[PDB]
Design a protein around this ligand. Structure first.
Ligand SMILES: CC(C)NCCCn1c(Sc2cc3c(cc2I)OCO3)nc2c(N)ncnc21
Length: 208
């Protein structure tokens, strides 16, 4: 049972720029996603200090990197705060509007795509390497949802009847045909060591 939504014009614009601009340093997408996971984990930890029951959905706070050549996907999994339906459909977009505006102006002023994180919109860097991104997420007091978008100005959201995750987010990157290097263990290990060696949570890189 799928609902389809239009990205706010600004977000659609950011995505086009990301997909269209010639920029070779694509590997920064992983750092942006791992960072978002780190932030989510930080929040659920902080919240658990005043309400321990919030960890009933899972006490483990970590990150998993799962590559799959068969499906040509790279999934970044975390046990963080998760996102609600309201987050996925309106709230995160509202916030992303200002970040986008600032980021695009900063670019014209000499900045580059690798700085997208300082504007709160790093998630969209996933499109530097993915033709389609599917996001499975579960927040403590909402249901598990599946958000998805191949850009083009729209995204869908549905209640996920798959396999329960308890609490957290899974960013599934359906890679572009010429970006399969991100499925190789050596390459992923290289990027993590280069841009995310100090994340304060365990990061497990699965092998195939
Ligand atoms: C609330 C605070 C933690 N900031 C969260 C920003 C949204 N977000 C993001 S960035 C993001 C993710 C999206 C999205 C928009 C953004 I911005 O629509 C598709 O899924 N990653 C998160 C994650 N791994 N866990 C929880 N929240 C995530």
């Amino acid at each position: 049972e799928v609902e389809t939504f239009a990205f706010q014009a600004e977000i659609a614009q950011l995505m086009s720029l990301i997909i269209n601009t010639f920029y070779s340093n694509k590997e920064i997408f992983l750092r942006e996603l791992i960072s978002n996971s780190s932030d989510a984990l930080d929040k659920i930890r902080y919240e658990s200090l005043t309400d321990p029951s919030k960890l009933d959905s899972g006490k483990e706070l970590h990150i998993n990197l799962i590559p799959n050549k068969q499906d040509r996907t790279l999934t970044i999994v975390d046990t963080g705060i998760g996102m609600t339906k309201a987050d996925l459909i309106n709230n995160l977009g509202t916030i992303a509007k200002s970040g986008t505006k600032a980021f695009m102006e900063a670019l014209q002023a000499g900045a580059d795509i690798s700085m997208i994180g300082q504007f709160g919109v790093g998630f969209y860097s996933a499109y530097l390497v993915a033709e389609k991104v599917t996001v499975i997420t579960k927040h403590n007091d909402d249901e598990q949802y599946a958000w998805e978008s191949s850009a083009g100005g729209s995204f869908t959201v549905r209640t996920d009847t798959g396999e329960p995750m308890g609490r957290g987010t899974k960013v599934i990157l359906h890679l572009k045909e010429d970006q399969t290097e991100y499925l190789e263990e050596r390459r992923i290990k290289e990027i993590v060591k280069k841009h995310s060696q100090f994340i304060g949570y365990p990061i497990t890189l699965f092998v195939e």
